[PDB]
Amino acid sequence: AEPEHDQRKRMGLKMLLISALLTSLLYYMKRHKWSVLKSRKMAYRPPK
Amino acid sequence: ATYAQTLQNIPETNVTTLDNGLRVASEESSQPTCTVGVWIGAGSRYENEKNNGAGYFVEHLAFKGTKKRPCAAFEKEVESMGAHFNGYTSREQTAFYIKALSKDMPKVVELLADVVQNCALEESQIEKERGVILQELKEMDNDMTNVTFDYLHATAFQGTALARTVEGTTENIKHLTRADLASYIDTHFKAPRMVLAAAGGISHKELVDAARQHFSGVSFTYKEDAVPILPRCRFTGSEIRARDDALPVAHVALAVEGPGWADPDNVVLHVANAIIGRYDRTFGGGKHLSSRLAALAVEHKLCHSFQTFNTSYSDTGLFGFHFVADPLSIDDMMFCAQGEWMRLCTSTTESEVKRAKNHLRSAMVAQLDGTTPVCETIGSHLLNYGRRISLEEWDSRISAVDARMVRDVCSKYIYDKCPALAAVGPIEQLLDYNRIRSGMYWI
Ligand SMILES: CCCCCCCCO[C@@H]1O[C@H](CO)[C@@H](O)[C@H](O)[C@H]1O
Ligand SMILES: CCCCCCCCO[C@@H]1O[C@H](CO)[C@@H](O)[C@H](O)[C@H]1O
Numbered sequence: 001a002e003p004e005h006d007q008r009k010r011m012g013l014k015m016l017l018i019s020a021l022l023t024s025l026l027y028y029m030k031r032h033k034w035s036v037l038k039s040r041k042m043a044y045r046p047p048k
Numbered sequence: 049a050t051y052a053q054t055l056q057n058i059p060e061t062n063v064t065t066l067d068n069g070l071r072v073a074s075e076e077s078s079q080p081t082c083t084v085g086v087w088i089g090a091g092s093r094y095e096n097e098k099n100n101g102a103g104y105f106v107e108h109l110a111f112k113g114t115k116k117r118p119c120a121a122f123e124k125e126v127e128s129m130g131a132h133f134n135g136y137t138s139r140e141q142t143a144f145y146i147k148a149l150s151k152d153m154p155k156v157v158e159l160l161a162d163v164v165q166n167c168a169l170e171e172s173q174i175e176k177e178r179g180v181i182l183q184e185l186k187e188m189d190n191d192m193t194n195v196t197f198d199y200l201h202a203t204a205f206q207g208t209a210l211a212r213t214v215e216g217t218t219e220n221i222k223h224l225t226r227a228d229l230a231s232y233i234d235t236h237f238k239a240p241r242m243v244l245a246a247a248g249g250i251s252h253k254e255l256v257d258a259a260r261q262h263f264s265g266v267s268f269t270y271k272e273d274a275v276p277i278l279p280r281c282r283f284t285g286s287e288i289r290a291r292d293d294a295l296p297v298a299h300v301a302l303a304v305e306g307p308g309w310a311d312p313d314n315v316v317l318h319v320a321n322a323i324i325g326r327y328d329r330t331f332g333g334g335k336h337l338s339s340r341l342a343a344l345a346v347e348h349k350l351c352h353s354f355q356t357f358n359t360s361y362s363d364t365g366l367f368g369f370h371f372v373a374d375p376l377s378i379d380d381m382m383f384c385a386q387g388e389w390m391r392l393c394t395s396t397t398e399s400e401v402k403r404a405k406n407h408l409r410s411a412m413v414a415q416l417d418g419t420t421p422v423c424e425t426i427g428s429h430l431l432n433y434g435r436r437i438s439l440e441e442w443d444s445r446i447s448a449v450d451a452r453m454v455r456d457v458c459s460k461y462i463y464d465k466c467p468a469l470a471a472v473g474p475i476e477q478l479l480d481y482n483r484i485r486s487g488m489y490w491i
Contacts, residue, residue, distance in 0.1 A: 033482055036480065036482055
């Protein structure tokens with residue numbers, strides 16, 4: 001029924017690894033760029 | 049008479065040190081008029097959270113009279129001799145100087161010494177200047193350019209001493225004590241940290257003589273003759289955005305950390321800044337100006353003005369640019385400005401530097417146009433380099449600079465660095481830090 005059974009699973013293995021890695025790296029990058037806004041501070045200094 | 053010959057034939061600058069540690073330097077000319085003053089290595093950077101704005105408060109009393117001679121007496125004496133008494137206080141340097149007839153160089157030196165040593169600090173004058181200073185802070189609060197540079201330091205050196213402004217805080221000015229100003233003076237206005245400079249028609253030996261006579265008060269301990277090294281000020285890539293769409297134009301200042309006085313690279317940075325130059329809506333040159341950025345500014349009406357700078361200090365500095373633009377042209381201006389910075393690091397031309405070098409030479413020669421400007425050079429030079437640097441040396445250094453050198457040095461301080469940004473006014477169009485940060489590489 002599914003002659004590709006074995007190959008499918010070998011791919012699934014690599015998919016899981018690449019995904020773990022890539023998701024992590026991209027998570028960092030997103031956090032990196034957004035750190036600018038995440039830690040950003042502000043104040044309201046109206047005149048006299 | 050060739051440029052070279054004229055540079056070599058310039059009278060040398062004489063320096064002699066007294067036992068108290070003070071240094072006396074001067075450049076002699078044949079001018080009936082002269083300028084002499086004392087350049088102190090003091091300023092806001094030396095102050096702290098409690099006495100910020102003291103050196104400034106002092107700068108206000110330094111002319112309101114001494115012990116030997118109260119206000120009116122002090123003023124009359126100086127006025128009646130046609131002498132001019134000016135001075136200033138900055139972040140790392142203070143100065144009090146007088147313009148007068150060479151014929152009075154000696155009386156002046158006495159006056160200077162009396163000002164720096166015996167300031168009356170009239171208890172009543174203090175409360176009076178307290179209100180004057182408070183008015184000057186409101187006047188300066190409308191000076192965008194200066195508000196912008198203050199903010200630039202406030203963030204570029206956040207957490208440190210260079211973050212503070214020269215004038216000081218409102219709380220300090222409202223509570224600085226007669227004792228605090230006194231303490232300031234005794235702590236900082238000290239012989240080894242001062243420089244008696246003079247230029248014009250004056251005898252170095254007569255200058256140094258009056259100097260010996262009035263700048264006495266030698267020190268006993270070792271702690272009194274040692275020049276304190278200041279703690280480093282950390283640079284921080286960051287931004288401060290003060291928005292007020294009610295303001296007509298917007299001011300923007302971007303900068304990277306600079307090397308600091310003693311570093312030779314400064315000659316290159318100044319050449320680099322010379323390539324980009326500066327501009328303002330009254331430069332007849334218009335669309336033909338050599339500075340590419342200036343050309344684009346004219347063609348696209350990018351700004352009202354812009355200017356590069358390489359502000360130095362003992363151990364650090366701010367290398368950057370500042371522009372004033374309409375709320376709707378900020379983005380293109382910043383785009384082109386950063387673009388040019390990339391060009392510097394990456395595609396500078398021999399032609400470009402050839403021009404920038406000439407421009408730089410005539411600029412250094414211009415900062416020696418009168419007795420006061422020359423005197424300022426001497427004071428600053430000894431105070432920063434511990435020795436005067438001739439125009440011939442500068443020219444020697446400037447001459448060695450080439451395109452490749454500009455690229456490497458510029459790449460060194462600019463490329464892929466995290467800048468410090470200060471934006472004031474109607475700044476909505478100025479894109480975020482991340483976008484700006486990306487304009488720091490490639491391109
Ligand atoms: C389910 C029956 C599997 C028999 C083949 C065993 C080899 C499985 O392995 C995979 O097979 C794929 C296709 O043959 C190849 O393209 C892959 O590179 C290989 O790793
Ligand atoms: C987030 C998306 C990640 C995709 C990465 C998956 C890459 C898997 O790659 C595949 O592995 C198979 C197993 O041997 C091979 O037979 C295939 O030829 C190969 O292309």
